[PDB]
Amino acid sequence: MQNITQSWFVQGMIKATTDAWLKGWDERNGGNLTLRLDDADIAPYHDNFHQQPRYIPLSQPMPLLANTPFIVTGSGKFFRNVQLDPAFNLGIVKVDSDGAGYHILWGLTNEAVPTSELPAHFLSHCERIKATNGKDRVIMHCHATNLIALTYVLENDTAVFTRQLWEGSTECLVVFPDGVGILPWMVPGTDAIGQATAQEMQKHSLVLWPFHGVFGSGPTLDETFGLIDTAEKSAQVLVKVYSMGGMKQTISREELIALGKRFGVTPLASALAL
Amino acid sequence: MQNITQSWFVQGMIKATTDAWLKGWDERNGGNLTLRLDDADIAPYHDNFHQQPRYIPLSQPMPLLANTPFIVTGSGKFFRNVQLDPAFNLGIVKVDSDGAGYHILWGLTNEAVPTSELPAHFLSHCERIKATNGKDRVIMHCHATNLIALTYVLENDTAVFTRQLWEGSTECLVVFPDGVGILPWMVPGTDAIGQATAQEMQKHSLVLWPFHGVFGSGPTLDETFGLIDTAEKSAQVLVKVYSMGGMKQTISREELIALGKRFGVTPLASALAL
Amino acid sequence: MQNITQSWFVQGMIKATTDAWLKGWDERNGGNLTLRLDDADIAPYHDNFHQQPRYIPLSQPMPLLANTPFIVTGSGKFFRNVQLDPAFNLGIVKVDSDGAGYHILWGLTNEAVPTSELPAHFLSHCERIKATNGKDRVIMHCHATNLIALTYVLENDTAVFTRQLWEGSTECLVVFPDGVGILPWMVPGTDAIGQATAQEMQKHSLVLWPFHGVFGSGPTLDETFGLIDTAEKSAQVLVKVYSMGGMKQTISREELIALGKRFGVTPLASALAL
Amino acid sequence: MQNITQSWFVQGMIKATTDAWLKGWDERNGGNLTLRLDDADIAPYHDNFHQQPRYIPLSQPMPLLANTPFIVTGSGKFFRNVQLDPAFNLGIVKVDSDGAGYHILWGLTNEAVPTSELPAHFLSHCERIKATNGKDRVIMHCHATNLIALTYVLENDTAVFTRQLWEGSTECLVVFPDGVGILPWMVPGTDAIGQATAQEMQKHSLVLWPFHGVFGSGPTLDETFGLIDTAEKSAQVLVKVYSMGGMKQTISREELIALGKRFGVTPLASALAL
Amino acid sequence: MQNITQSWFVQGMIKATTDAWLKGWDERNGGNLTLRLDDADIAPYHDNFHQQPRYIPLSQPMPLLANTPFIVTGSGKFFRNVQLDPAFNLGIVKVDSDGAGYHILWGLTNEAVPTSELPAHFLSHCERIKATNGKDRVIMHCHATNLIALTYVLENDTAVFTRQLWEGSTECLVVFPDGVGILPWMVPGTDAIGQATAQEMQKHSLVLWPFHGVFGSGPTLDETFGLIDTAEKSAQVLVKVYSMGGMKQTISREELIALGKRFGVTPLASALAL
Amino acid sequence: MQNITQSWFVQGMIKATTDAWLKGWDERNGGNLTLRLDDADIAPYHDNFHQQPRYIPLSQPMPLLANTPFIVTGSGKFFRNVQLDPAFNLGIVKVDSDGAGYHILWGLTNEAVPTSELPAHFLSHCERIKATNGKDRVIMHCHATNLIALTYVLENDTAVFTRQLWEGSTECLVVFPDGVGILPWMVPGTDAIGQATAQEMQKHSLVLWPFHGVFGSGPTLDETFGLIDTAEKSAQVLVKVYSMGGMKQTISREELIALGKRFGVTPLASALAL
Amino acid sequence: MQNITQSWFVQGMIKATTDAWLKGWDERNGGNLTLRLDDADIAPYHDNFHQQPRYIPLSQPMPLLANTPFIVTGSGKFFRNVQLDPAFNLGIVKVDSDGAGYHILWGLTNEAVPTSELPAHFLSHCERIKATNGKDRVIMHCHATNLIALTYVLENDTAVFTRQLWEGSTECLVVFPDGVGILPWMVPGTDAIGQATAQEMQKHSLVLWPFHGVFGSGPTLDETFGLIDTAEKSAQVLVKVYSMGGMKQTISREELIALGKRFGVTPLASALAL
Ligand SMILES: [Fe+3]
Ligand SMILES: [Fe+3]
Ligand SMILES: [Fe+3]
Ligand SMILES: [Fe+3]
Ligand SMILES: [Fe+3]
Ligand SMILES: [Fe+3]
Ligand SMILES: [Fe+3]
Ligand SMILES: [Zn+2]
Ligand SMILES: [Zn+2]
Ligand SMILES: [Zn+2]
Ligand SMILES: [Zn+2]
Ligand SMILES: [Zn+2]
Ligand SMILES: [Zn+2]
Ligand SMILES: [Zn+2]
């Protein structure tokens, strides 16, 4: 059938990129988003897919992702432009039967390498699928401004950074009890940064890249966007607070402890111990 | 009749949540809003309400609210999404004849506990109704950013905080002469925080939760939103001022005194005395 | 998930009713439309359905329709109004496990008998499902104006009426080779008219009710609407032609024969023989 | 409060005039519509009404309409223009305490006689209120094209005209069982035509003015518009039928009888007897 | 200043052409409209006008139109397209100081003869200005469909044609008491047809061109459009009536007489006498 | 005529208030705007004005403003709401023949004192008219955020404040060479603050109220808004600069001198001398 | 043909100015944008261009730009207003056959000097065309806020400023490896600043004007806007960082080196050496 642009998932992709562009998080082509779909999501639209789609092999096969469809932003595409031309800026792809590569069924442009960052996403989808028994479906990278700024002034240490972020808005502890993972700065678009981020994604829905940005995960687009927005709201508040000379008072350790108990979550111990 | 979504009060709910999302005050599901309606408001739409609505008993009955209808945001709902699907994100409810519980007449989703925060709102509506001879109709919680930030650097003291806020924009004294109430940080969603906020609401239209957010009241959605926006505008200005090294000059006590006299309001004495 | 109104099938229902209102075919509450859905269509929206939906038993069970979901216009609803309030004017229903009745999962108003015409539709869906090996999914009734007018002047005879309609636009023969079924006038909303229409639906995708309107079937909303529009376009042309004193020339029998052969359809013999 | 233009009843007025303009029924300033409101409808908008409104006395007081508010089209206003400037083209009025006259609370322009046709409407509202125990609230005049045309060729006789209209679409008998009232042509805007129409309105929801137009009544705007549209749809079909040389077959008397019995209405006897 | 497209008079031009395109009256480039403006209308927009505008001399000077501005449709422009590109399809022009020619201040395209029909319009504006003491400001030509059709079957005689049109809707007599002027068919775009139409415009706001269309005048765009629409509504009704075999009854002479008296107009005697 | 809401000046009022609300400058009812119109602007709309308008006398007559019309925001109105209901939130007024008072011709609500701040505006319009030979037409008050913040940290001295603002963006000197006037804090809405601001307006298009906001003037809405936006852009940059520890380098006096010479303006000497 | 406003390049101009206005970068008339087009871009619209266009000679001819068309913002035009009236605020121009001057084919207003800044743009287009073998087509000036602020606190030295900007977001090095050029403050609109900027444009796509703004270049509007937005995003982050007391850690020299190698760019040596 027609109107694929108005499908729930193309509409959701437009919402999340547009929202992020409006937040100031995705200058130029900075940012990427992919969403894991089910065959039944795309089946009504078969009509629209190439009879002979482009195939791109993967360097490390991912059999966990076999026969799995996704919608994704193209590499080099601007979040700002997605609402204006969804088909030019998004692609629907499907991993083949042994996960040795993927076919581009719909969307995007005719270049060599329209989805350069997709191998890195796939690696992280795998870890998140194992970590959550198949609940996580989204991987989102953006350049969340205050979170970036904090990476120049806070210790680049999971425990220290998580603790400040929890302190900066009450609900953070409940939204990311497992804390934010962190990496040293690394060269973007490399195997190493892909593998290293995926390893952090084993124990974190949210990972910081210092002097660059954030990488997050969730079961739905709303939940992923809302995770990033919550930590970035904290960061925004902390930037103000530090800029005014630092905390005179804050949430105390035993207050953070009682928060986790009431909401039934177990907070990252290292961050609590501070 | 049909078009309930276009009714004055569903349209007002969409306006206030949308406005607050755009201000940056309601990340994720952070925020709640309820508005007290009259039977005549909803009577034309009876057509649309469940013949057998869900009933939720209250832990402490509220006979002052007997047979009273309200429109409300669901728990877990995102302010951002209200404009996109008013019926999914809002509910119309009605307190039964002895105020022992409430029925969900319209809207929201099918979960256990679609309106978790409504008991706390009701407690505060009661106090505001007594405090204003029935003029206040709205209770609004949001995460007003600069007000949050100030809770890490200013003394958490009604008099001190009120005085800075009055100084930060001229008209604040006239808009909230009774000052802002404050509480210690407390675990959200608990009886204690509900009761404690309601007790502050006896003498304040506006109450701060440190490291979390604000809770405000008013006769209309515009007036409530406009109360919060005014104090948050002050806070925004103060964040700048403190960040530049503090006040070199400001509104003086006897200037604040003359302001209250000209506009016919009596300002919180403790705040004036500073 | 939210945005059920923007789902492909609610959007399709709005398109088809709106289009028909604009054609002049559905004055007041004249007209009905139902579309057979699959479980996977509505599964993403489960969120929105009543935990305790209304049950309406059927007078004659239909086990062929067991566990089958549909979207439908309410009885008494105006096609014109569907675009303005989809949820008030449409309902999603699901036939129970032995086809003894149906539950209203979503939409419509709180009256006794919100879907009076649904038993008649179901009977015809059954015949169309058997007749097409499960391809037909839509049943649509509207008051197609020129087709109505022709029922006062043409012989109320399948063969005669089909032949004029084929002659009135070239492509009609290919679109409905099996011809239009016809009934004597009967009292609307009765078992008899329901059963009699369903019996015509055994051999026809399109059935005339003299002095009243048309009843049609198809695999998609577009195809059903387009079937009715094609026969009503023919009728419109014939009204003009008869009004100008009748045909001086027309499509000849052996031309209609060659048409069926080229397009690979076998035309109703009785209509060809004229 | 503000947004009176978006109130349910101003929105309904815009819908009904716009719909009628699109049907081709209201050239120039041809047509008028008034809707009886309740005090509670306009009470939220008091804010917007003149402190010293214009008063227009009535020639014959109507105490049945005492203290009753209405929304109305201005005299000389074009249906086409209502959607473009609701406030210029509509007025809200209120009949005083002994029904000796009315005040214009809102809308319309500053001329002498902005609502020339309102006395005639009021007379008919009175009869319809008595005739329906207060259910009818709308009086609508438009120049329904095919109904006008039929007044040059059919006998200007209630029984004869009603019978043709019933025959021209099946559901007409059920929608107006009491038939259409008719008057001789009379000079428009006169007491006589006002009184004479009101007298027909004692026993008819729908009244024909030969060579001019129709005058109808109903409990809601949708129901009134839908009554006129149904009879005008019949007329449209009959114009076609007569233009093709007349009925070869039609609905028979005993078929019309069975229709009234099944739907529980008693049809105008004189029309049945034909 | 900017936004000239949103000025009242460009907006009015878009409304009237668009409305006429939707009525079916202006296929292709069939139709023309010009509106006489005042200097104060265009003065705020001076900003937008060519410093060196194109000058087109007139064959017969019109000193009555000296220094007078107008907005106009270009020759060869499609009514349908005006809403899509007002500036391409409309022009603002101004007659020079002794009425020997006109300058194109704004709009239209760069061809030889962008306003071919403007001399003919000007001649008719002159007569209408003299005839109405300066009240008429619009000249509008369109191909009103039923009025065209009637020119093949009715006597091409002012009195006969006026009388049928008055009979075809009650209010026609009041809207055009002076009747419709008529001409023999003539070759379009010629001096003769221009002069002959202007001479009819001495005593008529509305003039028929047989087998072609209508030419009308009024003080405002609404009033002119509404004059044409009223006579074309009559014609539409008469086409139906004649098509059904002619009038069985109609408005009688003494009824038409009483109509003119009540509304204070003196009807064309020749038409009354029939 | 109708469509007054779409007139150039109501549209301009909506643009300027909406723009200012979006900038964050007009919380609640904070802000006021008035624009001086000409009789010819409102003359086409006479149709819409009260036959008996409300009269409000002035305490000090202003014969310079005799017979002068203005469009204005109501007191207590929210800038945010103007786009939603222009007529509720704006008023058109006209000063009587000896400038002893004004009549409200259109718009606003029915209270005592719908335009409380208009006397103060009028006083300043007078001074600006004398100061610019009748070129200035707008007076605008808003709570420009960074300009407010700077009033707590910079010396409240015309010369010092002007100099920083010139330094903070290159073009400021050219946009306001005469500098910004300043007052001590004063109680708002008083004669004294009205008179004192008007006296500053003798030599300044822009005046600061410490701890409150700004008051500016210009020949058009765009030019006034653009003056305030330019100084507030400077302030925004300075807030950043001061917050980072102050200027390391800046525009030098002799650079500011050369700027004024090149653009042909004479800069406030006191500010240059610093 | 018509619809020139909807052409790809007028639509692109509206997008880029509107986006920049929304970013807060173009107060009042601050900013300019020009885009080099090809003859084939404008050829379909020839229809719309003046038969006798205004000619403006250049002071220094530019034969490299001979016969070259451009679309441009007018001098004195507000970025904010472009979306509201593209034709008033943009112009299409074409350089004559020996590059001695240019003709204004379309758009803009009738003043002396509608494009004051175009000579300066042309000089820079020339250098960018030589520098990139004809790939660059855009020159854009705006007042990027955080970049302006940084010019008061950072050393005004290409190497130092480039290095901070690279450090402030990872991808900056890849987006502008050649670094940002800088000039001393100079008087705007002068030959000297025009020539000096063009000389920087020999080796830089991006040039800072201290205390004023930025001047950038690119092959497309998106790429140019995205270059400025990227450096301004860095600046925004640095303002925060410096405001919080400076970097505790950052991207290291050998990390910046490895970045350039991986992406295949050679970074400005002077900036690397720091
Ligand atoms: Fe970790
Ligand atoms: Fe207190
Ligand atoms: Fe058959
Ligand atoms: Fe009767
Ligand atoms: Fe004549
Ligand atoms: Fe001064
Ligand atoms: Fe350089
Ligand atoms: Zn990145
Ligand atoms: Zn909260
Ligand atoms: Zn039917
Ligand atoms: Zn009428
Ligand atoms: Zn013509
Ligand atoms: Zn103020
Ligand atoms: Zn500049």
Separation CA A173–CA A261 (nearest Å): 11
CA distances from B156 to A258, C53, C83, G32 (A): 21, 51, 53, 49
8 Å CB contact between C55 and C98: no
Residue C136, Cβ density class (10 Å: 0-12 exposed, 13-18 middle, ≥19 buried): buried
Nearest to F92 by CA among F123, F49, F129, F52: F49
Q: Which residues are CB-contacts of G108 (< 8 A; sequence separation ≥ 6)? A: G74, G88, G89, G90, G91, G114, G115
F121 appears as a binding residue in the annotation: no
Disruptive mutation site among G205, G249, G259, G261 for chain A (greatest number of A CBs within 10 Å): G249
8 Å CB contact between F73 and F32: yes
Nearest to B151 by CA among B235, B217, B31: B235
Strands (E), chain E: 32-36, 54-57, 69-73, 90-95, 101-107, 138-142, 181-182, 206-209, 213-218
Residue E113: left (phi > 0), alpha (psi -120 to 50), or beta? left
Chains contacting D (3+ CB pairs below 8 angstroms): B, C, E, F
DSSP category for residue F47: G
Indicate the residue of F168, F244, F252 with minimum beta-carbon distance to G153. Answer: F244
- E68 alpha carbon, distance to own chain's centre: 18
The residue of chain C with its CA nearest to that of D222 is C28
DSSP category for residue G74: P
* C226: phi then psi, degrees, rounded to nearest 5: -65, -30
Chain E positions touching F7 (Cβ under 8 A) are 8
8 Å CB contact between A146 and A24: no
Chain E positions touching D153 (Cβ under 8 A) are 241, 244-248
- C141 alpha carbon, distance to own chain's centre: 5
Solving technique for this entry? X-ray
Chain F positions touching E6 (Cβ under 8 A) are 6, 8, 11
Chain B positions touching A171 (Cβ under 8 A) are 28, 30, 188, 212
Structure tokens at C146: 């020129």
- B70 alpha carbon, distance to own chain's centre: 14
Does B145 sit within 8 Å of A236, measured CB to CB?
Answer: yes
8 Å CB contact between C181 and C155: no
8 Å CB contact between D18 and B23: no
Separation CA C20–CA F11 (nearest Å): 38
Separation CA G255–CA G259 (nearest Å): 6
- Diameter of chain F measured on Cα atoms: 64
Residue length, chain B? 274
First to last CA, chain F: 57
Catalytic-residue membership of E255: no
Structure tokens at E92: 């603002």
Nearest to G150 by CA among B53, C10, F245: F245
Ligand sitting nearest the alpha carbon of E205: 5
Disruptive mutation site among A2, A3, A8, A14 for chain C (greatest number of C CBs within 10 Å): A8
Strands (E), E41-154: 54-57, 69-73, 90-95, 101-107, 138-142
Chain D positions touching B8 (Cβ under 8 A) are 1, 3, 6-7, 44
Q: Is C26 helix (H, G, I), strand (E, B) or coil?
A: coil
Indicate the residue of D11, D40, D220 with minimum beta-carbon distance to B6. Answer: D11
How many domains are there within chain D? 1
DSSP category for residue G121: H
Using alpha carbons only, how large is chain A's radius of gyration in Å? 19
Strands (E), B50-177: 54-57, 69-73, 90-95, 101-107, 138-142
Structure tokens at C81: 């109004």
Distance E151 CA to ligand 5 centre (A): 16
Residue C126: left (phi > 0), alpha (psi -120 to 50), or beta? alpha
Separation CA B21–CA B19 (nearest Å): 6
Separation CA G201–CA G69 (nearest Å): 21
DSSP D33-49: EEEE--HHHHGGGGGGS
Which helix (H) or strand (E) is G142 found in, with range? Answer: strand G138-142
Using alpha carbons only, how large is chain B's radius of gyration in Å? 19
Question: For tokens 């639906």, what's the residue?
Answer: C201
8 Å CB contact between C197 and C210: no
8 Å CB contact between D139 and D215: yes
User: Which CATH number characterizes residue E16's domain?
Assistant: 3.40.225.10
Separation CA G227–CA G132 (nearest Å): 16
Distance B204 CA to ligand 2 centre (A): 6
Angle, helices C8-23/C221-243, rounded to nearest 10 degrees: 10
F141 appears as a binding residue in the annotation: yes
Chain C positions touching B76 (Cβ under 8 A) are none
| Contact exists between C and G (3 or more beta carbon pairs < 8 Å) | no
DSSP category for residue A104: E
Which residue range(s) make up the domain with F117?
A: 1-274
Using alpha carbons only, how large is chain E's radius of gyration in Å? 19
Separation CA G48–CA G6 (nearest Å): 13
Separation CA B2–CA D12 (nearest Å): 11
Chains contacting F (3+ CB pairs below 8 angstroms): B, D, E, G
- Write b or e for each residue in C27-60: b if 16 or more Cβ atoms lie within 10 A of its Cβ, otherwise e: bbbbbbbbbbbeeebbebbeebbeeebbebebee
Residue D254, Cβ density class (10 Å: 0-12 exposed, 13-18 middle, ≥19 buried): exposed
Question: For tokens 């949540």, what's the residue?
Answer: B17
Residue D245: left (phi > 0), alpha (psi -120 to 50), or beta? left
Angle ∠(E35,E38,E43) on CA atoms, nearest 5: 115
Disruptive mutation site among C3, C5, C8, C37 for chain A (greatest number of A CBs within 10 Å): C8
The residue of chain C with its CA nearest to that of D261 is C187
Structure tokens at B176: 């909230």
8 Å CB contact between C270 and C159: yes
- Among C27, C111, C117, C232, the active-site one is C117
- Can you list the pairs that A88-93 forms with residues at least 24 positions away whose Cβ atoms lie under 8 Å? A90/A10, A90/A13, A91/A115, A92/A37, A92/A42, A92/A49, A93/A69, A93/A118
Q: Which residues are CB-contacts of E75 (< 8 A; sequence separation ≥ 6)? A: E29, E32, E113, E114, E115, E116, E117
Q: Which residues pair with D206 in a beta bridge?
A: D216
Separation CA G16–CA G267 (nearest Å): 28
8 Å CB contact between D167 and D153: no
Distance C142 CA to ligand 10 centre (A): 6
8 Å CB contact between B200 and B176: no
Distance E214 CA to ligand 12 centre (A): 8
The residue of chain B with its CA nearest to that of A224 is B28
- Write b or e for each residue in C232-247: b if 16 or more Cβ atoms lie within 10 A of its Cβ, otherwise e: bbbbbebbebbbeeee
Question: For tokens 């400076």, what's the residue?
Answer: G246
Chains contacting E (3+ CB pairs below 8 angstroms): D, F, G
Distance from CA of F130 to the nearest CA of B (A): 31
Strand order in the sheet with B90-95: B54-57, B101-107, B90-95, B69-73, B32-36, B138-142, B213-218, B206-209, B181-182
Ligand sitting nearest the alpha carbon of E159: 5
Q: Which residues pair with D22 in a beta bridge?
A: none
Angle, helices E118-131/E191-200, rounded to nearest 10 degrees: 20
8 Å CB contact between A9 and A41: yes
Separation CA E37–CA F166 (nearest Å): 46
Question: For tokens 């209201």, what's the residue?
Answer: D26
The residue type of F207 is: V
Residues that place a CB less than 5 A from ion ligand 7:
G 158, 181, 203
Separation CA D203–CA F185 (nearest Å): 74
Nearest to D95 by CA among D72, D77, D78: D72
- Residues of B with a Cβ under 8 Å from any F Cβ are 19, 167-171, 175, 222, 226-227, 229-230, 232-233, 236-237, 240-241, 243-252, 255, 258-259, 262
Chain D positions touching B44 (Cβ under 8 A) are 8
Structure tokens at G208: 């800072």
Separation CA B68–CA G109 (nearest Å): 61
Which helix (H) or strand (E) is G227 found in, with range? Answer: helix G221-243
Structure tokens at C41: 């269509």
Antiparallel, parallel or unpaired: β G90-95 and G101-107: antiparallel
Half-sphere exposure of E2 (CA within 13 A, CB side): 22
Q: Where are the alpha helices (DSSP H) in F187-252?
A: 191-200, 221-243
- Residues of E with a Cβ under 8 Å from any D Cβ are 19, 167-171, 175, 222, 226-227, 229-230, 232-233, 236-237, 240-241, 243-252, 255, 258-259, 262
Q: Is F35 helix (H, G, I), strand (E, B) or coil?
A: strand
Using alpha carbons only, how large is chain C's radius of gyration in Å? 19
Q: How many CB atoms lie within 10 A of CB G261?
A: 11
Separation CA D169–CA C108 (nearest Å): 27
Separation CA C22–CA D22 (nearest Å): 10
Nearest to G238 by CA among B45, A151, E88: A151
Strand order in the sheet with A213-218: A54-57, A101-107, A90-95, A69-73, A32-36, A138-142, A213-218, A206-209, A181-182
8 Å CB contact between B4 and D11: no
| Contact exists between E and B (3 or more beta carbon pairs < 8 Å) | no
